[PDB]
Structures are given as structure tokens and as C-alpha cells.
Amino acid sequence: MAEPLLVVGLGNPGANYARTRHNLGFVVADLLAARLGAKFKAHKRSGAEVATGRSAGRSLVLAKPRCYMNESGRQIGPLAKFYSVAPANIIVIHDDLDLEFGRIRLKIGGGEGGHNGLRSVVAALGTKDFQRVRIGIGRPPGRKDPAAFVLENFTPAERAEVPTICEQAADATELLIEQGMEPA
Structure with a gap:
């Protein structure tokens, strides 16, 4: 198991999209890197950026795609097969729409x-069998389009808890890594 992991924080490029729901993958990857004393550096080859760390003895490369969501997998396909990462040694942190807020x-x-x-990462890796950390965000309220619901910043009360959720989801990740599905 002298193997590296690829942790992947899904999110969108820009200041508008920094506090929207859709980007909690970007945020949880920012605390994983700070926590582990890692730095993000333009990773020219795949087009995305990168940070190298280690957690539990297992070395890991954390990526945050510098292109927008539907195109996310065009940078993570090249990024792994170049890092020698097996599709099942990738951890995508995304927000989950069909999970309840704080889940x-x-x-x-x-x-x-x-x-x-x-869908963009599955369409790049060929398979859909990668490891996923799921951060529940809730269901839209009534008439809200799901896809437009996600491109909106949490609401004043949801975001009192955000900083502490992106903290338990950095733990969740950190703990898969050292055990795996034995951890759930």
C-alpha cells in the first residue's frame, strides 16, 4: 500500500462562487491543506492546481479544479493517470443534494x-467507482431549481454551522484515509 491518494475538492472558479453551496468541496480542501501544512500551486500539466501532504503515513495530492464544474473531470482525468492514482484511490469531496443539511x-x-x-469526473475516469465524501446541503425550498439552488450562498443560519461542517468533513476525509470503509 505504498500508494498515494488523490483528494479532490469540487467547486467553481471565482469570488461569486466562493461561498455558494456548490463549492464546499473547495472549502474542505482548503482546510485539509492548511491542517496538513500543504500549499496549492498551479499544476500546469492537468490545468488544475495542487497541494501535497500526508495523513496517517499515506501520502496525498489534493486538487482543486481551476475550471468550472461540468468541465471538472477534464483536469482530474489527466491529473490522476499522471499521478499514477487508481480511480478508486481518489476522494472527491462534494456537497450532497439528497442528504440533509449538516449530514x-x-x-x-x-x-x-x-x-x-x-458526472464530469465519472465521464473522465470511465468508472463511477471512486470514493466520495458527501456533505449534505438540503433540498431546494419549493420552486427553487435544484441547479440554481446550488449556485446560491447558504442562508445566514445555515452558515453559522458551515465552518464547523467543513471541519467534520475534513475529519471524515482524514479518517477514511487511515482506515477506509471500516471507518463509517
């Missing part, structure tokens, strides 16, 4: 939808 789960494989991005 976090770990699942490998296990189809997952409503996310422009994980």
Missing part, C-alpha cells in the same frame, strides 16, 4: 446525482 457520509462507488461535476 456527512462516505461512499465509494455508488451512483450519485444532481451534480454537474461528478
Whole structure:
């Protein structure tokens, strides 16, 4: 198991999209890197950026795609097969639409939808059997389009808890890594 992991924080490029729901993958990757004393540096080859660390003895490369969501997998396909990462030694952190706000789960494989991005990563890796850390965000309120619901910043009360959710989801990740599905 002298193997590296690829942790992947899904999110969108820009200041508008920094505090929207859709980007909690970007945020949880920012705390994983700070926590582990890692730095993000333009990773020219794949087009995305990168940070190298280590957690539990297992070395890991953390990526945050510098292009927007539906195109996310065009940088993570080249990024892994170049890092020698097996599709099942990749951890995508995304927000989950069909989970309740404040809910976090770990699942490998296990189809997952409503996310422009994980279709983008599955369409790049060939398979859908990668490890996923799921951060529940809730269901839109009534008439809200799902896809437009996600490109909106949390609401004043949801975001009192955000900083502490992106903290338990950095733990969740950190803990898969050292055990795996034994951790759930």
C-alpha cells in the first residue's frame, strides 16, 4: 500500500462562487491543506492546481479544479493517470443534494446525482467507482431549481454551522484515509 491518494475538492472558479453551496468541496480542501501544512500551486500539466501532504503515513495530492464544474473531470482525468492514482484511490469531496443539511457520509462507488461535476469526473475516469465524501446541503425550498439552488450562498443560519461542517468533513476525509470503509 505504498500508494498515494488523490483528494479532490469540487467547486467553481471565482469570488461569486466562493461561498455558494456548490463549492464546499473547495472549502474542505482548503482546510485539509492548511491542517496538513500543504500549499496549492498551479499544476500546469492537468490545468488544475495542487497541494501535497500526508495523513496517517499515506501520502496525498489534493486538487482543486481551476475550471468550472461540468468541465471538472477534464483536469482530474489527466491529473490522476499522471499521478499514477487508481480511480478508486481518489476522494472527491462534494456537497450532497439528497442528504440533509449538516449530514456527512462516505461512499465509494455508488451512483450519485444532481451534480454537474461528478458526472464530469465519472465521464473522465470511465468508472463511477471512486470514493466520495458527501456533505449534505438540503433540498431546494419549493420552486427553487435544484441547479440554481446550488449556485446560491447558504442562508445566514445555515452558515453559522458551515465552518464547523467543513471541519467534520475534513475529519471524515482524514479518517477514511487511515482506515477506509471500516471507518463509517
